[PDB]
Scaffold this active site. Structure first.
Site, short mmCIF file in Angstrom:
data_model
loop_
_atom_site.label_atom_id
_atom_site.label_comp_id
_atom_site.label_asym_id
_atom_site.label_seq_id
_atom_site.Cartn_x
_atom_site.Cartn_y
_atom_site.Cartn_z
N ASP A 135 97.69 -71.70 134.65
CA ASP A 135 98.33 -71.29 135.90
C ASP A 135 98.81 -69.84 135.85
OD1 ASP A 135 100.70 -73.02 138.15
OD2 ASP A 135 99.22 -71.44 138.50
N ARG A 139 103.34 -64.79 139.93
CA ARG A 139 104.49 -65.64 140.24
C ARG A 139 105.02 -66.36 139.01
NH1 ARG A 139 99.91 -68.09 142.28
NH2 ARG A 139 99.38 -70.10 141.30
N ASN A 140 104.20 -66.54 137.97
CA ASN A 140 104.60 -67.21 136.75
C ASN A 140 104.93 -66.23 135.63
OD1 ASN A 140 104.50 -69.87 137.69
ND2 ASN A 140 102.30 -70.03 137.30
N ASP A 153 106.15 -71.28 132.85
CA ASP A 153 105.43 -72.37 133.51
C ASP A 153 104.10 -72.70 132.82
OD1 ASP A 153 107.29 -73.11 135.45
OD2 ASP A 153 106.57 -71.63 136.90
C1 LIG Z 1 107.59 -65.51 142.09
C2 LIG Z 1 108.64 -66.33 142.85
C3 LIG Z 1 109.47 -67.14 141.85
O1 LIG Z 1 109.06 -67.35 140.71
N1 LIG Z 1 110.62 -67.63 142.34
C4 LIG Z 1 111.45 -68.24 141.50
C5 LIG Z 1 112.10 -67.61 140.44
C6 LIG Z 1 113.02 -68.33 139.67
C7 LIG Z 1 113.69 -67.70 138.70
C8 LIG Z 1 114.36 -66.59 139.01
N2 LIG Z 1 114.95 -66.17 137.91
C9 LIG Z 1 114.65 -67.01 136.92
N3 LIG Z 1 115.03 -66.96 135.64
C10 LIG Z 1 114.62 -67.94 134.75
N4 LIG Z 1 113.80 -68.94 135.26
C11 LIG Z 1 113.45 -68.96 136.55
N5 LIG Z 1 112.66 -69.94 137.01
C12 LIG Z 1 112.23 -70.88 136.14
C13 LIG Z 1 110.86 -71.04 135.92
C14 LIG Z 1 110.39 -72.00 135.03
C15 LIG Z 1 111.30 -72.81 134.36
O2 LIG Z 1 110.94 -73.78 133.47
C16 LIG Z 1 109.55 -73.75 133.13
C17 LIG Z 1 109.40 -73.29 131.83
C18 LIG Z 1 110.52 -73.14 131.01
C19 LIG Z 1 110.38 -72.68 129.71
C20 LIG Z 1 109.12 -72.36 129.23
C21 LIG Z 1 108.01 -72.51 130.06
N6 LIG Z 1 108.18 -72.98 131.36
C22 LIG Z 1 112.66 -72.67 134.57
CL1 LIG Z 1 113.77 -73.68 133.71
C23 LIG Z 1 113.12 -71.71 135.46
C24 LIG Z 1 113.86 -67.99 137.40
C25 LIG Z 1 113.34 -69.64 140.02
C26 LIG Z 1 112.69 -70.26 141.08
C27 LIG Z 1 111.75 -69.55 141.82
O3 LIG Z 1 111.06 -70.08 142.87
C28 LIG Z 1 111.15 -71.51 142.90
C29 LIG Z 1 110.33 -72.05 144.07
N7 LIG Z 1 109.35 -71.06 144.54
C30 LIG Z 1 109.25 -71.14 146.01
C31 LIG Z 1 108.04 -71.33 143.94
CL LIG Z 2 108.25 -72.03 140.30
MG LIG Z 3 106.33 -71.31 139.21
#
Ligand SMILES: *CCC(=O)Nc1cc(-c2c[nH]c3ncnc(Nc4ccc(OCc5ccccn5)c(Cl)c4)c23)ccc1OCCN(C)C
Ligand SMILES: [Cl-]
Ligand SMILES: [Mg+2]
Length: 266
Positions: A135, A139-140, A153
């Site tokens: 993925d 955005r990731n 992610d």
């Molecule tokens: C590009 C738009 C976007 O990503 N929006 C978004 C951003 C965050 C966010 C902002 N600041 C952050 N700091 C830390 N983490 C996040 N978001 C996340 C992402 C993944 C997470 O767990 C997955 C993971 C964890 C560890 C290792 C691998 N993968 C976690 Cl816990 C936190 C973050 C947050 C949310 C959004 O958008 C959410 C919904 N959007 C409409 C898609």
């Molecule tokens: Cl997300």
């Molecule tokens: Mg995501």
């Protein structure tokens, strides 16, 4: 390595604020208050949609907590209740896609090429760990500081991003490290276009036939032919002919030693 992953009690963290929700779950800005340590840590808490056994979830969570690379997000903790809640350090500048869209006028050639290096380093580490992202997109990629980004992610799969997937992933459901290279090329195209949508206005049903006809994402105006050729090689039909993440680190690092030679920005 069990110590790498903290199993958080519900009392150890508090969901202070919503950061955003999607189909897969809701991410919160919160505070980690570990038991018996007298500190308050700002963290991000992703609560996945209420759905898969606890042992299977923890086994994948252990892998996510074991990554040790400056450009790969590490899972700090997990809370297993009715939902799965993932806790990691807060990335205050959000995702890289929103960042480049908000700061497009203030982003130079050095910033863009350094991001291409850091993303390639994080992906090369995931490949060395025999991990396929499936993925990779702008955005990731999260922004801790404007010049320190991390891939996130990965391994969450354990609708579909058609416009980021390699052709063999769309038609044959084949996911390899070379299929991640295709997604990396699209990710680079997102940054070089300052956050433009790939194949804008085209339905995902037609993407496969477009790639079969030989059409690819257009050359961003700021990219020189050397930068675009590297992006084009990531979109080859023969996945073995696409560049490796190791070579991608080297090429973009050399381009980062003279950024204005390879990116032409106003
Ligand atoms: C590009 C738009 C976007 O990503 N929006 C978004 C951003 C965050 C966010 C902002 N600041 C952050 N700091 C830390 N983490 C996040 N978001 C996340 C992402 C993944 C997470 O767990 C997955 C993971 C964890 C560890 C290792 C691998 N993968 C976690 Cl816990 C936190 C973050 C947050 C949310 C959004 O958008 C959410 C919904 N959007 C409409 C898609
Ligand atoms: Cl997300
Ligand atoms: Mg995501």
């Amino acid at each position: 390595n069990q110590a790498l992953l903290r199993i958080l009690k519900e009392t150890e963290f508090k969901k202070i604020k919503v950061l955003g929700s999607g189909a897969f779950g809701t991410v919160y800005k919160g505070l980690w208050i570990p038991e018996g340590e007298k500190v308050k840590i700002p963290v991000a808490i992703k609560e996945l949609r209420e759905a898969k056994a606890n042992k299977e979830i923890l086994d994948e969570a252990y892998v996510m907590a074991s990554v040790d690379n400056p450009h790969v997000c590490r899972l700090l903790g997990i809370c297993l209740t009715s939902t799965v809640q993932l806790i990691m350090q807060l990335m205050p500048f959000g995702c890289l896609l929103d960042y480049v869209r908000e700061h497009k006028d203030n982003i130079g050639s050095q910033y863009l090429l350094n991001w291409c290096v850091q993303i390639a380093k994080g992906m090369n580490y995931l490949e060395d760990r025999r991990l396929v992202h499936r993925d990779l997109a702008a955005r990731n990629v999260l922004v801790k500081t404007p010049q320190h980004v991390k891939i996130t992610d990965f391994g969450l799969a354990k609708k579909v991003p058609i416009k980021w997937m390699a052709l063999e992933s769309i038609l044959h459901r084949i996911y390899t490290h070379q299929s991640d290279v295709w997604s990396y090329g699209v990710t680079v195209w997102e940054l070089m276009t300052f956050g433009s949508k790939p194949y804008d206005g085209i339905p995902a049903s037609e993407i496969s036939s477009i790639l079969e006809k030989g059409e690819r994402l257009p050359q961003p105006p700021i990219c020189t032919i050397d930068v675009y050729m590297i992006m084009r090689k990531c979109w080859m039909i023969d996945a073995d002919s696409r560049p490796k993440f190791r070579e991608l680190i080297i090429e973009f690092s050399k381009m980062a030693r003279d950024p204005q030679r390879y990116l032409v920005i106003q």
